[PDB]
Enzyme design. Structure first.
Site, PDB file in Angstrom:
ATOM      1  N   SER A   1       0.848  -1.196   0.000  1.00 43.81           N
ATOM      2  CA  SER A   1       0.000   0.000   0.000  1.00 43.81           C
ATOM      3  C   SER A   1       0.882   1.244   0.000  1.00 43.81           C
ATOM      4  O   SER A   1       1.753   1.355  -0.881  1.00 43.81           O
ATOM      5  CB  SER A   1      -0.967  -0.132   1.174  1.00 43.81           C
ATOM      6  OG  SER A   1      -1.950   0.880   1.136  1.00 43.81           O
TER       7      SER A   1
ATOM      8  N   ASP B   1      -9.526  -4.425  -5.554  1.00 41.55           N
ATOM      9  CA  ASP B   1      -9.054  -3.641  -4.419  1.00 41.55           C
ATOM     10  C   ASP B   1     -10.145  -2.685  -3.948  1.00 41.55           C
ATOM     11  O   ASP B   1     -10.668  -1.886  -4.732  1.00 41.55           O
ATOM     12  CB  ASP B   1      -7.806  -2.871  -4.862  1.00 41.55           C
ATOM     13  CG  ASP B   1      -6.989  -2.341  -3.698  1.00 41.55           C
ATOM     14  OD1 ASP B   1      -7.586  -1.807  -2.739  1.00 41.55           O
ATOM     15  OD2 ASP B   1      -5.739  -2.434  -3.754  1.00 41.55           O
TER      16      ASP B   1
ATOM     17  N   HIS C   1      -7.492  -5.477  -0.795  1.00 40.58           N
ATOM     18  CA  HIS C   1      -6.270  -4.694  -0.618  1.00 40.58           C
ATOM     19  C   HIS C   1      -5.245  -5.453   0.219  1.00 40.58           C
ATOM     20  O   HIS C   1      -4.053  -5.478  -0.118  1.00 40.58           O
ATOM     21  CB  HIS C   1      -6.623  -3.362   0.044  1.00 40.58           C
ATOM     22  CG  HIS C   1      -5.517  -2.355   0.038  1.00 40.58           C
ATOM     23  ND1 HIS C   1      -4.917  -1.909  -1.120  1.00 40.58           N
ATOM     24  CD2 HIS C   1      -4.928  -1.675   1.051  1.00 40.58           C
ATOM     25  CE1 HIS C   1      -3.996  -1.009  -0.819  1.00 40.58           C
ATOM     26  NE2 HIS C   1      -3.980  -0.853   0.493  1.00 40.58           N
TER      27      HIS C   1
END
Ligand code: NA
Ligand code: NA
Lengths: 317, 324
Positions: free
Chosen positions: A105, A187, A224
């Site tokens: 991320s 995601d 994610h």
């Protein structure tokens, strides 16, 4: 790309060093370090204890990580100082040897920001393996003009932000070291990611851009956090870490690897913890810093986002 | 301190898509050839018009009475084609007029898209930066406009209308390349009440006509919040003439606040125009709107030329997603 001397750090070396830890070793004397850069709202251990800390160990690395306080919610530019300092330290501590960087991320945004604006580390990072990086930020935050009070780094990861503008305009949406980007059309934090094209937030020109659905089919679903923890993600990351080219190779993975659950080699306890990876992030956000404007760009980045508005006002040339 | 960052593209000029003979055919001077002209001023027209249609009723006669030889470009058809091609006409014209006036810098004066064209040329064609002494832009849309999008009514629109829409690949590329900071001394005269170009209300860098380090003159900031001039009036009004005269005469290359004030806030066509010119000036926009309706139209923004593509990667144009 920016050239010349590295910008000065805003934090003292002692502070930056305190944010860096390696498993069973000091950064000043470490064999085969791999630097893990965590996601928003987490520490290094919270991002990686259940996944790439044990997985990189079994692949023959010493996992090391940074934990910029508070929980990666401060200014992404400060978080990057922790990373740059750590690369410098781990390069020296491994005998002046390049090392891989593996991220989740925001950690990938941090890595690419550091490679863009701190030239000294380009010769020290062997390769970048980024899981669900948000180089363009995310549009799921909504427009900047409507954003609720949010953490410094949440502003900076909002699509349209001065930070993402500056990264792009300084050349940072093209890879700088051999980079692999593993991401998912499904995601739920970072979008757009559906096009398998340069539109995707995780895409870097000349990088090895691996949208999981392009390999696994439209029915393959990882979120994610699953972008970091899945068995498919492990096979791709293993390919990237072993490749002589510094990027994952298509010949190393295929349809049989398209398992969305936590990586097979994790223990049952790690698989449970990996599935629950995201929860600490919300808790850190609730207790963490919040503001009504995007943090100012540091002087080294301001020339690349003239016209954007940060806390001190509109960036001028 | 501040890092070294080249604010603009550098190096050789990009190649033209049009031959010199075609670009030359689009350039005309009043009573002279560009190859041998005294004190030229280059006039760049607005969307939907030729040079004469933009300026016959205003800055052709007004610049003549200030001692210049007015010259203009008329990129076909009526400035409705690719703004990048329209810019080739301007770049070639600067090269020709600089050479035809003895290698002396010349001023550029523009309306509407013409200012976007001027700044696009200065951004991406470095050779002309040393040949333009100043830019006097009336109602320039450097950020494009949020009004009257290309998908309103018929789902096709003129190439340059796509490019002048806020968020377009062209306006993105201009901003990312450094083009919202002035490159030569620039004055931008505009109006908060502009009915074609918005946003223009803030009297700040948010405004489409604003350039950093420029002399940014929003009419209401001088004349009061209830002063009204429209997109065409920004070019033709007496107030606009006073500001333009100041910019052309100024030794700094920009209009000077000392040269205008509240007593110049006359929104009607410039005093020195003949009655016939004043009537035509008030009717400036009608032919342009009609030409937009009758001209080329398409369902996508024209592709960026290779020199501009690195500054708008990820935008969508006719061929697909922009890549460097
Ligand atoms: Na927070
Ligand atoms: Na239309």
């Amino acid at each position: 790309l920016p050239s010349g001397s590295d910008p000065a750090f805003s934090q003292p070396k002692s502070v930056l060093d305190a944010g860096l830890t390696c498993q069973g070793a000091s950064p000043s004397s470490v064999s085969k370090p791999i630097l893990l850069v965590p996601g928003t709202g987490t520490t290094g251990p919270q991002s990686f204890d259940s996944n790439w800390i044990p997985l990189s160990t079994q692949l023959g690395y010493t996992p090391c990580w940074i934990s910029p306080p508070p929980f990666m919610l401060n200014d992404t530019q400060v978080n990057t100082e922790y990373m740059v300092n750590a690369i410098t330290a781990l390069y020296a501590g491994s005998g002046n040897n390049k090392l891989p960087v593996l991220t989740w991320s925001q950690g990938g945004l941090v890595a690419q920001w550091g490679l863009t604006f701190f030239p000294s580390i380009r010769s020290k990072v062997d390769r970048l393996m980024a899981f669900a990086p948000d180089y363009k930020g995310t549009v799921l935050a909504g427009p900047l003009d409507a954003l609720a009070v949010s953490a410094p780094s949440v502003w900076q990861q909002t699509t349209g932000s001065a930070l993402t503008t500056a990264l792009r305009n300084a050349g940072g949406l093209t890879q700088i070291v051999p980079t692999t980007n593993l991401y998912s059309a499904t995601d739920e934090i970072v979008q757009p990611q559906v096009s398998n094209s340069p539109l995707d937030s995780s895409y870097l020109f000349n990088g090895k851009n691996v949208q999981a659905q392009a390999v696994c089919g439209p029915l393959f679903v990882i979120d994610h956090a699953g972008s970091l923890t899945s068995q498919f993600s492990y096979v791709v990351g293993r390919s990237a870490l072993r490749s002589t080219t510094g990027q994952a190779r298509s010949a190393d993975y295929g349809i049989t690897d398209c398992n969305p659950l936590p990586a097979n080699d994790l223990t049952p306890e790690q698989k449970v913890a990996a599935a629950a990876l995201l929860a600490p992030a919300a808790a850190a956000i609730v207790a963490g810093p919040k503001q009504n404007c995007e943090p100012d760009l540091m002087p080294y980045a301001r020339p690349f986002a003239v016209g954007k508005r940060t806390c001190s006002g509109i960036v001028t040339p």
